[PDB]
Structure formats: structure tokens, C-alpha cells
Amino acid sequence: SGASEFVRSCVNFETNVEFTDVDAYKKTHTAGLASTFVVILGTHAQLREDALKELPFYCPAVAEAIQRVKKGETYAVLAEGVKNEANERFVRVLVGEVPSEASRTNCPARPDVVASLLSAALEEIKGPETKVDVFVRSTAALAIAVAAARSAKRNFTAKEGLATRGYCDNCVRLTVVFPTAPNPSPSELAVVATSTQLCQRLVDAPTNLLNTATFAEVAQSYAKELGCAVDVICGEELRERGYGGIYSVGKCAVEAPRLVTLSYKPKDETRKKVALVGKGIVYDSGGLSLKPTNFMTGMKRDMGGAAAVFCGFLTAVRLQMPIELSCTLCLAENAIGPDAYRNDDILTLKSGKTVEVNNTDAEGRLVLGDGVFHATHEISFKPDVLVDMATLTGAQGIATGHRHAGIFVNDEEEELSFLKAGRASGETCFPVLYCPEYHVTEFRSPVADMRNSVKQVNNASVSCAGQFVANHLSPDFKGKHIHVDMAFPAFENDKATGFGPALLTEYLRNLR
Amino acid sequence: SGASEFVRSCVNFETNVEFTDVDAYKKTHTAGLASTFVVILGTHAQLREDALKELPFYCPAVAEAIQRVKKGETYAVLAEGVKNEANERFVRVLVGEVPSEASRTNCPARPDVVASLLSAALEEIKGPETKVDVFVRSTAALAIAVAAARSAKRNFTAKEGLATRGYCDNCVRLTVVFPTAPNPSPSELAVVATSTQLCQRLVDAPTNLLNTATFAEVAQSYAKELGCAVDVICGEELRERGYGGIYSVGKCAVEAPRLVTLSYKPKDETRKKVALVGKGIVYDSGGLSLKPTNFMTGMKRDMGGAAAVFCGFLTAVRLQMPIELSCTLCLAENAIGPDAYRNDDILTLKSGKTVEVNNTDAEGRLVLGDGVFHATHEISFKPDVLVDMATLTGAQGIATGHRHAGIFVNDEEEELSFLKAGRASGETCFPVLYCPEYHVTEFRSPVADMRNSVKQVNNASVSCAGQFVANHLSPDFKGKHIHVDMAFPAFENDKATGFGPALLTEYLRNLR
Amino acid sequence: SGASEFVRSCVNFETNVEFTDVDAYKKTHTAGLASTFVVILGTHAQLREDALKELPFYCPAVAEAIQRVKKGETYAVLAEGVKNEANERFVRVLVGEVPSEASRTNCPARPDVVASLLSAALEEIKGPETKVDVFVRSTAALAIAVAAARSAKRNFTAKEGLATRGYCDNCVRLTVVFPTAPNPSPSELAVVATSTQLCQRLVDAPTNLLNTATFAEVAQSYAKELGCAVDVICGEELRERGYGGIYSVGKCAVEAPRLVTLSYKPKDETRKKVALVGKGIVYDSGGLSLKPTNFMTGMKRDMGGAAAVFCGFLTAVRLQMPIELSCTLCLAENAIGPDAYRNDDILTLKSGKTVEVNNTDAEGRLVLGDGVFHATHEISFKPDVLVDMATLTGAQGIATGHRHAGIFVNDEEEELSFLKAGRASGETCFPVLYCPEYHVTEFRSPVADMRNSVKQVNNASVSCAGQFVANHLSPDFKGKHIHVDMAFPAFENDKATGFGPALLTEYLRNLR
Amino acid sequence: SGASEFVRSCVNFETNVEFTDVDAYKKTHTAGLASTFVVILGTHAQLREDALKELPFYCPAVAEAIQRVKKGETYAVLAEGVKNEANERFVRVLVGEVPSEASRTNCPARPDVVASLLSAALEEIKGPETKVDVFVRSTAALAIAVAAARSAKRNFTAKEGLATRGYCDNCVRLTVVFPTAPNPSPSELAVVATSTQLCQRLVDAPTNLLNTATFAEVAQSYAKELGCAVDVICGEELRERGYGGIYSVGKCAVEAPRLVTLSYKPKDETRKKVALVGKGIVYDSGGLSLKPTNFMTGMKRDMGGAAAVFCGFLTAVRLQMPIELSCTLCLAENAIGPDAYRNDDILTLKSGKTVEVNNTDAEGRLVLGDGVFHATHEISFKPDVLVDMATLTGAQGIATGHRHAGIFVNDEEEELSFLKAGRASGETCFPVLYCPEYHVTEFRSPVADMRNSVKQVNNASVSCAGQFVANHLSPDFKGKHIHVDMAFPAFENDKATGFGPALLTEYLRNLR
């Protein structure tokens, strides 16, 4: 009933962020400013432009704020003599200075800071459904929209009885104002913002609300709404049909494991054919290889990859992108108990390859193994590109850091393409070593085709986990393979960031 | 059947210790000494008094023992020419010297040493139901009675087939002889000794004998005997009635969790109204936050708080104290398995506050949370004082040591009062920091009202665990709150001490 | 070279904080406000008082700030139309709301929040020697002065070439304005603030600047300035004169250990006689019991106790308090190397008692042992009270938390008195268990009078370390003994707080 | 004594490998085969070519070996009827099959397998100076030469009295035979092989032979031989001239730290100007941040970076490459003792920036910091490119694995160029994240310009160590910066690989 209230919240989810521009704002709001809380974000150079002097909140207090504000920080004032709909004497104005410096591996618009400046600014807002206008000087529309959405306080929350108000603190109604009409359009940015926030909510929902059944149910309802095909292979049907990876990982849990596959065939021409596969570990105990407490917190987030691909798919269908798409969610709970798969058991994955389990907490790659094979051999079409997303390795952070998802890719060109998409979306990635000839030796088994956990921990371990998944691709698959490890990018300041869908959306938007 | 034999043992439990005085001993036993094993305990000054020279076991051997015995130690002799009922040539006499030094935070009669000297003396006794007379020179009746009771070999034991003789080695029948008629009276000391020993037996019973059902059953039978009301909220009834703390902690176990509440309304005037709440974790695995083996031994003792309050209650009813009393036992097993509450799950306690679990082994405070709210909002009366007892923190030892229970108290005066009661009973306490404004910040949650385990371990962690419990008190409760952490005082030399009931008894006896 | 520049900085240290009141501010600054950056701190009730409306920075913007500001937080505005000396259009005004809630163990004026609000407010100030006025509504002068001083950015720092400008960033000149003439007076608060900041600087100085020689040298120069007697027992003189604790702990280091004793006899006659002893471990490697890296960072702060007592002394002499005072600094570096005292070596302390070392990282209590004996047996007078201060135990935090120094005290009345002094100064304390009879057994040695490290870690270990020190008091000392463990209170947000001197000052000021 | 014998061995070092081709072999050795031990290495396709049938060891036994041999493995036969100089009945022939599969990040000629096949083949050779001919089918001359050199048993060794025969087991004289005249030439490959082996020997020499003095002495003697300028800044001269990083790291050791700089100006004019800087930690104890035993073994290899750049330089000078070159060896021992730099000390590097040490075992970046600044500000010319090489992070392995050195590079084009050079040399690299904006925040200090060890371990830690070094580049340096982390590539099967010099050689050879 808390579950079914959280399901209804996901199924009907709309965003609290709208997009417009300065001139449209001027034509529409002829009754002065339409809010009494205003955030103005730009670089030092952008904030010093004459154009700012004509904006409806500009006044001498705001000009002083611009002169005094330091890089990376906000400077708040009360602006007087700025007419407004509420007829307040004062308007609250925050000015935030964004750094201009950006490395070649980073988004030039620095949405990392935009997000955190906005986030800090919005902590002053309590009341329900308060109008806030964010005037931005960057024209990197997509990156900005993501940053705004993930910062708009639509997070999962069960504080102060909010379980009966959609597990959401509805404190902010946000309007982002670009300098000029944005590309992409306002309504596309809204669909993107909606996906980012839904992903954010799915990731931080506790497992007692989001389990394999409830997640499957969300996908099914969205499937009906969007006019998409959907297929669920549940529980014993997985064992009987040979899906020994995902089945064995999930069979101990109270809610059965499931492979959930959604399909979209566009009405217009198909420019490409793409398969998405996502690690949907709704909770990770570690299994018989039990994690210590300090590593087991935040493991409700082990379904981050499935949320990312689910929300990427949802975006692409709503934007009616000209790409044939499958989306496979690999849903399981990694529980501990008498029927838990063991360290030494030998599983037969759907690939037909045998796996000796030497670590029950290298489970995500088992479910992805079955997912990727399903995507390359069991569905209605042959994808040119396969993207698998997972929040899998604590070594991901060590390798590529908190803000760059590690990517293991079998084609230089598609890798570059995927990196460009991260830089444009602000959901940035960095490559890990692609070198299968070295990685495969880490999984040598004396009794099965392979083990699931590396012999040496100190040997390109993010890459190895990608290689394990690659080992279960259909032998006839000759297409491009992108493996994303997004363990740390999926959360910031101990809250989900909604990372993944906008990355995908940008990558897919630019396929030809 | 071993269970039901242990239940019958608890339900009919009588003590093996009786109390009298020197002059009553002289009038009654006109056939010489009534035993052939005699222990004489006092300080250096007490033992050198002329009065000793008139005692029925005094003789030249005993006088030499007194001259030679060292502080903290016993000195054993065979006394000749001391007539006795058994007509033995010799009488075994042990003389034990108690230190006189006692700090302001300690019981001046030093029952710590009395206990350990007596304990050592009674190791020479094997045979069944052997009469032993302990002549004590201290007049601190209550403290002495406790020390005697906990040292009288009525411990739980399953050695050498003793499962079929009440899980008890019935080797000693003990008579304590004070210098003068004691205050309180012999029969009150017996009731106290009975409570101490029953508590001792409950604590060291293994969980395969004492689980949530069997403990509940003991309470129910005592309820019928004493003419007290009793109420049990069991298993699914806890989930359905919103007791999400205690339910979630216990639901994985084979025996269901239970809230067991006993009530006593005195026949005569009510001087005060007091609620007792006790942590009844019959076994602690740690749950998904599994303890290492060396920390998981002695975790049958995690119900020590429930035993303490149950036995305190039982004493107060049998002494017909003029206080209206409730006693709430928070009974659960913290098991590991598929339906175990998770690190990241969000529980709704009966308080209505949401708790994000970041450590499944900070479970006692969850069950106490529901207990204290039940006691402050769901029962027939409004208590002036609430005492919650738990064996909860390994940090308790670090803070206040092995012999002083840590107390977290919201009122200086009641704290002092409670400390005086510990010093008189010899079940000593010491305060921990009371400072809610600092403790509450340790439980900040990004998704719920609070977490259950501290962010920083190094920040008054015994106090913090007390504060967590305080957070779930009914908002209308304006009364005094005493939180006792008795982890280490509950056992000594790897055996239960029966700590708690006499502390309570003394505190309650002195309320006005 | 950098060392003698840091010595000159300490020797000539003046504070950047001045104190006054509203009416004296009004008579003096008749050109309006004397700064253009203003902080106003008070409680919700204090900030809503009519009196505020007449202060020289009050205006409608500021009134709105007061209505909107949240508890524990600051709210910044630009105030227009406010008379000021610079005649700026705007004055920067920050309003900070202090909580009114304070436990019985806490300072009612909540300087903890005052400090952190001020600290946050002062992060906007970069330029040199910028005038800032802090109007406070609390009349708890002493607490406020400390909070202000420690928050005024006079910290030790070697950033950006500041080694040649006294290791100090001179960015703020601070004026604190009370509602009425403060008690104590402005010039007394300035001396106190000077002491707090000097202590703060000594504690966070690195050991390559503050070693045993340089610290000794500071004390000697201050001694000459203040007209105080001073005595140094250095290196081999310590071994030869029997100071085997402090000598053995320090003898491996490059700079020799030293006992530095300062004396002050007042001009007025006084009955009151007090000895201060401080743990001066300029760096703690752990010795042969080497600390891991994550515990060894911040161990330049192991001289916190010596800084505290040195600065308490300096305050008391500058205020010409009517108390005869000695101050003994126990200076050593705990280094690792061939001549490092060993785990198993047997030392002969000055007390004449032998100590078997079973942990080289329980070193502070060794140097304090020699310090306290020196203070109770080797100096010109017999103190009524001995206070020893040390930053010693990581268990201190576990016991009494980050903000309350643990106190081990042999006299209930003096303990209460010392607690009252912590509450008034805002440098709060809380008692630990005083029970020597239990503590002494933790130091049983089979080959010497005692060990130095507890057998059991989980047995009132802060108390035990206090007891060890007590064991080396002169046998003829019958006076009051206060042992302060200030490990965690000495730092906050990874910067020194200057904790200790004001506590002492307040305790000493109120000796009757 | 053993030291000066190891110095003489390094100074006069000649290789045991010679290079030729099939046709030149045929014209020269007209008495048939010039050895009686023959290794033939190629791929499945290469080994089945008709050309093999005409080689002087071909016979029906060898043909069967080719048909039966498995990939990655060797297959040995005794070949009969093969013309040879010794006129033996049989010639020992080993056929090794190399895989053809190579990823885009790997050397296509797979010298990794060539090396290990050759290595296995050469384990049969014991006798002194035994002639072995290796016929290879790959034309990747440079890669092959390296593989051969590092596999030719010229390793450091002190077994069986070999301390008096140059710490070298002279068991093999090796002749590598390509299909056609190789590019580069035989005599260039010999110089390269000489460098690889010398590097291999320097890396696995124990510190009791190779310390900072002895390494400095080798460099000086080579300097004289080659006609190169050389400069040494030794011990106290480093402190006095402001080199606080390298000085502080090394000052505890018995042999003083040294900055050793060699220069080469070519005879031909050249625009290209390159600086090499190498981490020369001759032994790493960890300092006060002491390593456990299992991490401290192989720490004689912490000078791997200095050996690499020293040997790269030596190659480039002997080949008279048209590049102006400096080579700075940052020589120190990281010892433990009383004058060991501390965790909390604040160092002033030559850059003029202050460093708060929060880990004494992040020492290599301190010495490199002074090295890189010296190279960019204190030498006779302004390099266009700076390459710093170090064996620094155990995280390097986690990130980029055992065979790919991690590279942190400030210019995408130069990175690609450096990667191409690793693929051609077979000393392969892979990029780590370049994103200074994220890395610099990991080194925030409250008392100095920066810390030296990351706050978070799980945040692109190889990259962060690179960034630290970058922070101490001269502010006027606008050139390209390549930071190489070669911790694991420097050793294989617990023996030094000689990694680095050939990578450099190839990169330098191809500068445009």
C-alpha cells in the first residue's frame, strides 16, 4: 500500500521544471516578475554582459552582487523596486558564478557547478509549490536541463509523513530561462528532465518499495501507455528456459527475479537498431560473500543501470526517435539464506557457458550475461549496437572517479561518439582499457568455462567485469558493444543524481 | 520439551537463600552450628571486633585465620571443638576480608568483593542441597542479599544431564546471618534474591530454550499468578498495528516478535506512576550487518534489559509497592535470511516517524523505540517516569566500564536519585552525557526522518543510542526519562550477574 | 628560519577582536556605521525585540531577513539607506539565528552555533584588515568572546607565502558589540580572546615549526615579559634527575624532551594555590606501537593540553588573578627509531614507581605522571588543586563526544564547580567515572609496580588513563585533582578550536 | 665492495643479444646452423608459410612440431640431419606459436607472448655463453628486440657466488633472426636491447647495492663516457636551495637525497626540446606511514621511473637523436626514524608552494614535484614536452592493469602519439582521466596550499597523483605534459621487465 502509492507516483510521473527564454518571458509576464525568488547563473564573463542590465530583476543590489560574487559560490540579495505579481516589496535574488574552465574530458558548460549552486539556492525554499525562476546564461540546453531537473527537490523522500503525498516534497515549481529559444526545444527538455527525475527517484527508493515485482510493474504500465511491446520471464520460467545466471542470483529472494524486455519500432524510417541492457539488482546483500555494513549501505542503488536504460528508452519513445529499440531490465535481489547460490556452485548461463562462482558478490555481471545474450540471440531483431549499463564496481571510482562513468567499448569510433554524448549531456564518461586478450585469463576455472570474479584484483578490474559480460554475447553478434560502469556517478552527496538517461538520449539522438 | 522443562523451572522459581541474624541464629540453633561449612565475611575492622569471639564457630584456628587473611582474599581452616548438628569433628570455616575503601560512585559495602569471595568459597561445595551459613558483618542488607543470591550457584546450567533436574545444580542451601535484624526484612530480601537469580537464569539461558514465545509464556504465567493484566501484540498484529520497528527487526526469525505488556494497580494509594520498557532481543545475529564470531558470542544476553524490567516488576508486585506500574517487554530475534530487514529499508515506527536503516545491528533501539511510544501513548495511564533498560552497546564498556551501567537521563534530580539507588543496591550506575542538541545530528537522513546508527562512532555513542529512543517518545510525554545501558554489568567471568532488578527495586521503593 | 619566524609570531601575538556595546558604539561612531560588513546574531526571541529596530544597520531589508532566517542558519542582505562612514550605497548585513534550546550540560548561550554562524559569515571576507562589526544579543560575554576569537580567521596558515607574514591571514578586524557594557570588561575579553587564538595557533602549527625547543623558547620569552619565574629541565638532566617517564618517551626524538615550569606569585595576598600540568607531545608517531596513517594525522595536536595550560596561565597573569600558580609543560616528541623506549622496557618515574611499558602509544600519561609528581613534590609551594590537561584518548570521543572534554575528578564539589566553569566559558566538560578501586586493576604488572596501558580496552578507559596519572601524585598531596581529556574538543572541522584556556580562566576566576 | 662491483657492472654493461636476418645468416654461416639450440617463433599463418621450409633448421620433425603446437605454447623436438657447425647428430629446436589476435590498445606483434615463449625456451639452457638462434617471423623489429632482451637471462642475480662475476648469469648468447633486414638496424636494436637490460638490472638490484649514491655514481660515469653535462644537487644543498619536497622525503636515510640532471645537445641543429623526469625512490619503507610487509616487498623497484628515463636518455644519446634532452633523476630513500618527515609537517617545495603531508607514503609525487619544477624553471632550456615517469600507485594496476602503464596527459594529440609509441615498442600504455578541475579538490588543506594524499581513495586516484605533480610545474611552462605510472608494467613473474626506455625511445624517435 506504501508500495502501490510509490507505483502510482512512478507511473504518472511529471516533472516540476519548465523551459523558456528571456524574450518569451518578457512577452508573457507583463505584470512584472512572475516569481519572488530568482536565481541567476552564469560565468564571470556572462554575468558582466550588458544584456543582464535589461533583465526584469536587475537593480543596483543585483549589480553589486555580480561585482562581489566569487567563483563556485552564490551571493544572495534582496532586490527592491522590482515589480512582481505577488506585489512583495522585495524579491529574493541569488547570483551564482560558474567557472569557465573545463577540461577536454568535461562538459564545457560545467553543469556540475550549475547543479550544486542551484541546489544550495533551493534549500531556502520550504513552502509548497513555490515559483522559482532560474535565469541561465549558458545555451548548452540539454546539460542545463539535466542539472536543473536533478537539483529541483523532486527526490524520493519519506520524511514527515510524505509517504501519503507521493514520497515527494513538492516545494519547488521551477522555470529555467535561457538567453534565447533553446535547442532542443522546451518540450524536449521537459521530457528529458522528467526522465532524469524519475531515474533519480527509482534509484533512491528503498527496496521495501522498489523490488523486482514493483519495478516490473512500473515497466509494464509504461509499456501499455507508450504502445510498446513487453515481455517478462519470471522466476521458475527463468530456470526452465536456461537463464541460470539471473535465476541463480535471484532465487533466494522473497520477490522472484525477472527479465523484462520492452520493444519500440518507430512509425518512420529506422536509421539504426539498438539494444539496451541494464543491471537491476534491487538490493545487494552480497549473498554468501556478505558485504560489511559500510559497503552494504547505498546498495538499493545496485539497480541504477536498469533505471538508466529504462528512462533512456522512455525518453526515446516519447521523442519518437527513428531507432528500433529493445530495453532489457535484469531484475533480481541478491539475498542470503539456505537457497542462496554458493561460492563453488556451477551455473549454466543462457549462453550455454558454465560459470564457477568464486564470489557471490560479483552478481551483476551474471545477470547482465543473461541479459546481453537475450538481447543478441532471443529477441526479434539483430542490434547494431548493444549498450549495457551497471552500477557494479567500487573500483570504478578508483579508475575513473566520481563524475565519469567508466566505459569499456569494443570500437574506437563508437567510444568517441559515446564520449561526445557524455560531454553534451553533462553525464560524462571516460574509457577503461579494452584488451580482451589480457582480461580473459583473469577468469580461468579448473572445472568450468570461467569463474565470475578476477584472480587478481590489481589488473584492470573494471575492464575485466566488462569482459565477463562480453563473454556471454551471442557468438554471431558482430556489432558494437558499449559497457558502462556508473557506480559513483549515480549518486552525489549521498543522493541519487539520475545519471544515465540523458547520456543515452544524447548518444541515440546523434546516431545515423 | 527441554523448553517446557525450562519454562516450568522459571514459572515456579524459588531462591536457595534465606536471611537471619546472629541472635535469632543463637535462639534457634541450640544443637550447635546448623551447618559444617561456614563463611565469615567482613572488613579488617569488622573482623577484629570482640563480637566475633562469641559467634558459634569461633575458635583458635579461626582467630589465627582472621590475623593472617589478606584483603580481597579468603583464608580457609578446619575448626575443631565446634559442636554441630552433623556431629563432625571439624567444621570448615572460610574467612574473607572485604576492602573498606569505596569511591563516591561505588557501594560502600563493596558487594563486588563479597560476591567474588563467596563465589570462590562455594566452589568447594559439590554435594546436593548442602547447608552453608554465611555470617556477614556488613549491615547493608540489600546489597548483601544481591551479592549472595548471584553467588549461590543457582545459575543456568546443562552440564551432566542437569536438563532433567531443572537446568540447575542444586548444590547449596544458603543462610546469610547479619549482625542484627536486617532492614529490609528477611522475607523482602528473599523476594529480591529470587528476582536476581531468576534474572540471572533468564539471561544465560540459550536461545533454543529462551526465545520470544517461551519468554512471553513465562510472563503470561507470572501475570496469572500475581493477578496482573497482560497484553501481547504478536507477529502480524505488530505490522498491521504500525509497530514497524519491532516487527521489522523480528520478522525473519522462526519465532515471531511480540510486545508483552504487564500492568499492576496497587490496592492502596498510588504515590507515583512508572513505566518500564526492556530490550528483549532473545538472540542477536546482527542481521545483514552480521557480527564476527567473537562479538556474536554472549548475544543470548541481548534480552538482559527485558529480564531486568520483568524481574524488577515482579519484585515490586510481590512487595505490594504503592506505585502504578507497566512493564513492556520488547521481544524479538534479530535473524538473518531472505525476509531480513535491510540496510536501506525505511521503517515506519509506531511514533509515525520514518527510519532509514543504515545498520541492522543497531536493532535494540528500534524495538525500544516502539516500546517507549507504546508506554507513553498506547497504555491506560500516563507515567511520570519512564525507564528503558537495554544491553546494547559495546561502547557502554568503554564509557562507564564493566560494573557501572551507563545512564542517559533527562532530569538531574532523578538521575541523582537513580544513582543513589544503584549505590544502595550495589548494582551501580554512572551518567553519560545528556545533550540532545548534539546527539540528534548524528542521525541525519537524506530520505527519512532519521537513520538508526550514528554517522560518527567517536561522538558520545552511548548517549546517541539513548537519544534515538527518546526521539520516539510520545510528543505529549513531559515526564522523566531514564535510559539504562547495562551491556557489561549483566555478566561477570562469562556468567550472568542478574543485574537490574534490585537497582529498579531500590529506585522504586524510594519514590514519593 | 621559518621556526624563528613562528616563534616571533607567538611571542608578540595580539588579537584581532575588540569588544564594546551598543551605547558606546553610538557615542563613538557619529558618522553612522563604522564598517560596511555587519553580522547580527541572536535567538528568534532576541531578534524580534523592539530594541533591534534602533540599531544603526536596521532597515526594511534587515527586517525581512529576520522574518525569513532559519534556526542555525544565516540570511544575507544588502541594506540600503544605512548611514555609514564610507558612505557606501549598500551595507552587507548577515543575520544569524541562534537556537534557544540548551541542555543542562551545555552553555545556554550556545556559542557552538554563534561560532559556526560567524565562521560562515566571515568566509565572504578576503581583503586585508577588513572591518567587521558583530552585534550580538547574548550577554554571556565570556562565551561569546571565545566563540568570536576562535572564528576570526587568525588561524595558523602557510598558504600563499604567509610564512613571511607571521603564518597568519590578516583578513578580518573584528568588533563585537553587546547590548550593554559587558562583564567581564572589554579589556579582559581581549586578553581572553588573545589566549584562545594563541592556543589555536600553537595547536595547528606543524611540528617542523613547533617542537620541544621552540615551544620551550616561547614559554621562556613570555616568562621574561610577564615577570614570571621559569625553570627548564632538559634532556640528559631529566634522566639524571630520575624523570624516567618523560625522558624515556622523548629520548629518541631529534629535539630533547623538557619539563618547563612557570611560576606566578600575585601582588595581593591570596590563600588560593593552583598547579596546572599539561601534556606537551609535540608529535606522536606512536613510537614502536606505530599508529596507522589515518590515526597519525592531526597528531601535531597532541600538545593541546600544554597549550591550554600555558594559555590559561598567561591569561591569569595578565589579568593579575589573586591565585598563586604553577604551570608545568611536559614537552616531548614520541619518535620511532633505535633508542625508542620499548614495549616491555621498565621505566622508573620520578614518583619512584616502576612502569612496565605494554604500549608506547600510551605515552602522554607517562609524561604527565612525571609532571604531576613534579607539581606536587618538587616545586616551591603546595597546591590545593591540581589540574592536568591532555589530548590523549580516541576513546574520549566515544565517551563524552566532540564538544565535551571528559573530566576525571577526585571530589564531587570541585567537579561541579569545574563543570559550571565549562558551561559559562562555553568550553564544556562532562564527568567520566571516578572509581580508582576498579581502575587500578587494569594496570597489573607481573614485573613492575604497574603497566601503562589497560588490559581491557572496554572498561572505562578514559577514567583508567586519569587513574594512571593519579598513581604518580606525591603521597602527601591531599588536595583536589582534576584530569581533563580534551582530545576532540581541541578541533572542529579539522581546525584547532583553541579549547582550554577560557575553561581554566573561568574556573580560576571563580575560586572561593 | 659488492656495491663498487655492481657499479662497475652497470658502467660497462653490454648486451648478450645480436640481430640479423635470414639472408645475411645464410651468406655468413655456410657450414650450416651456427648453434645447436634453435627457437622459431611466429603465428599459425606465419609458421605454415612456404618460406619456413627453406630455413636451415627445417626438417620433418620440425614440420610435425608446427602442425601440433598449440597457441601460446612451445613444442620441442630434436631435429636430425640438419647441417650445423658443431656437426652434432641432433639440433634442439623449439617452435612457439604466437597468437595473431591483438586489440587496438595492444602491440599487434604480441611481444608479451614472444617474451614468455622465449623465456620458457631458455630455461633449458644452463651452460656458459651458449649460442642460441631465435628465428622470428614478425617484422616488428623494435618490439621484438625488447622482448628478446628482457627474456635473455641477463637479469640481476646474486645466486651461487655470482656477486664476483658481475651479478649476472652469463648462460645465453642470443641471435635474433628476422625474415628481412630489420628496421631499425641491427646496431640500433643492440643499443635498445642494452638499455632494456640495464634498466631491468637497475630495477631488481637490491637497495644495499643500488642506493642514491651508487645510482648517482652510475649516472656520472655514463655522463663522462657519453660527453654529457651532469649536475648533482646533494643533501644539505637541496634544503638550502629550497628543494623541500625531495629533501624532506630523503633526509632520514643513510645516503643523502640527490637531484641528478644530465643534458644532451645534438651535433645537428634541432627544434625539438624534451625534458625527462624520473621518480628515483631507491627504497620505500613508507616512512612513518609504514607499509605492511606484503606491500613493502618489491619496493626496491620504486626507482623504476628513474631507471626508465636514465636508460631512455642513454639510448637517445648513443643513437645521436636530433633532440635536445634533459634527464632529471629524483633520487631519495624513504626511510623511517627520528628525522623522518611527518604526517602533518608542512614542506615548501621549490615551486614555492606549501604542502601539508597527510601521508608519508605518497612520497614519489613530492620528489617529482621538485624534479618537474627544476626541469621547467632551473635548467638551460625550455622544453616543449615534459615526461615524468614513476612507479607510484598500487591503484595503477586496478585502473590500467599489469601490462599498460597509466598515462595522465594534458594534450589529446600528444597522448595519442605516446600511445602509438607504446604499441610500436610493445611497452603499452593507456590513458587515465585528465580533468584537473576535479582532481585539485582532493588535495584541499586547511593550513597549506595543498595536501599530498587524496581525501577520497575512490576518486580517480592515479589521475590525482599526476595532478599533484602538475601543480608544481613552472607557471610559465605552456608545453605538453605526459605523466606515466608504470608500477606493475615494471615487473612480471616477480622479475623486472626493463619497461620504459623503449617506450621513450620510440616516442622520441617519432617527434615531428
Residue numbers in the entry:
A (entry chain A), B (entry chain A), C (entry chain B), D (entry chain B): 10 to 521
What do the study authors state?
Leucine aminopeptidase (LAP) is found in all kingdoms of life and catalyzes the metal-dependent hydrolysis of the N-terminal amino acid residue of peptide or amino acyl substrates. We report here the X-ray structures of three kinetoplastid acidic LAPs (LAP-As from Trypanosoma brucei, Trypanosoma cruzi, and Leishmania major) which were solved in the metal-free and unliganded forms, as well as in a number of ligand complexes, providing insight into ligand binding, metal ion requirements, and oligomeric state. LAPs of the M17 family of aminopeptidases are bilobal proteins with a highly conserved C-terminal domain harboring the aminopeptidase activity. They form homohexamers of approximately 330 kDa with the active sites facing a central cavity separated from the bulk solvent but accessible through solvent channels.
TcLAP-A crystallized only under citrate-containing conditions, resulting in crystals in space group R32 with one or both metal ions missing from the active site. TcLAP-A crystallized exclusively under citrate-containing conditions, which led to the absence of one or both Mn2+ ions from the active site and hence no electron density for the inhibitors. Apo TcLAP-A and the other LAP-A structures show completely ordered active sites independent of metal or ligand binding. In TcLAP-A, some loop regions in the N-terminal domain (between α2 and β2, β3 and β4, α5 and β5, and α6 and β6) and in the C-terminal domain (between β8 and β9 and between β10 and α11) show conformations slightly different from those in TbLAP-A. The corresponding residue numbers in TcLAP-A are K288, D293, D311, D370, and E372, and those in LmLAP-A are K299, D304, D322, D389, and E391. The analysis of TcLAP-A showed the presence of two well-separated peaks, one with a calculated molecular mass of ~320 kDa and the other with a mass of ~170 kDa, corresponding to the hexamer and trimer, respectively. At all of the concentrations analyzed, the hexamer was the most abundant species, while as the concentration was lowered, the proportion of trimers increased.
